[model samples]
Target: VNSFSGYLKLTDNVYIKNADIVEEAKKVKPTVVVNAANVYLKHGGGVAGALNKATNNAMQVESDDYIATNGPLKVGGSCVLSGHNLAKHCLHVVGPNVNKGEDIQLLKSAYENFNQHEVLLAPLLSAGIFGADPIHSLRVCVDTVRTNVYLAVFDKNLYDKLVSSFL
Candidate 1:
């Protein structure tokens, strides 16, 4: 039998899991889920949307008011927001936009932002609509993130590749 439920250790404390980010984030109390967010902090797509739904759209409302208070994040920056339903906070990062001439350094910074938290939950940032190579993005996560981390991934193919290369 093939096991998809194990973790692939990266650092002494950091690991990768073939699991849902939201589900894992809820399991670890006070976990800060890093959202592959946009400029205005709108919880619309990807991890942002999943977490927004998890919190019952309250995340959107919080994001709305937060943007009104603190300006938009533009591209390649990050901010923290309140998240309900077990998870402690939502760490929103405007990952690198290849079209904007941004690259992995910005993404490195984005993952480093997760360093502020002890228990971190994140996906492959910028590998979706933002146009980054998944393996490259995963490498960035490896280079950064100094604390306990779970690089939660939903795709079995990606999970397999990560395990082959990293584990």
Candidate 2:
């Protein structure tokens, strides 16, 4: 019966979770959950893919035409989708493609571009499947904004180390 989960003291309002992102979303009930999208706003892999599947792929289908017509988004640009199954709103942030060694500065820019809200949940942008290192993404997120940030992570070791580093 180990119920430790995880925590970090990034701020009184910011916290981390070592649990399934969707399951944690059910508990946190954030006003918006951010999904990392590339410049083209495709939700094909990583957090984007998971969120798309959770919402029955509506996000992908909805964002496609807009992206096709609007051309690629700037690294920090975003698109919003309201009335998602999990939260009141969901947004896709155009983040750097880390596989290409895009600078982490774009990650910071992406974090800054998100619309301000009382509560927001996001994964480490560009970290999952997008190829950015997890710790670097975590650092940028913590440094970029003061809004409450909820992180969803499943690795026990990563959870402990990150939480311990903050403490």
Candidate that would win on TM-score:
1
Candidate whose lDDT is highest:
1
Clash list (residue pairs), candidate 2? none
Candidate 1 — which residues are off by over 4 angstroms?
1-5, 99-101
lDDT of 2: 0.72
Q: Please give each candidate's TM-score.
A: 0.87, 0.84
User: Taking the tens digit of each residue's C-alpha lDDT, what string does model 1 give over 51-163?
Assistant: 88888898899899989998899676888888688467778888886766786578887777777887776788887667788788888887787877777877789888877
Clashes of 1: 0
Query: Candidate 2, residues 1-167: lDDT per residue as tens digits?
Result: 11224555477556787776776666656678877778776777677777778878787787788777887778767777762777778867876886877776788888886537656777777776777777877777777867777778767787777777763
Error of 2 at 117 (Å): 2.2
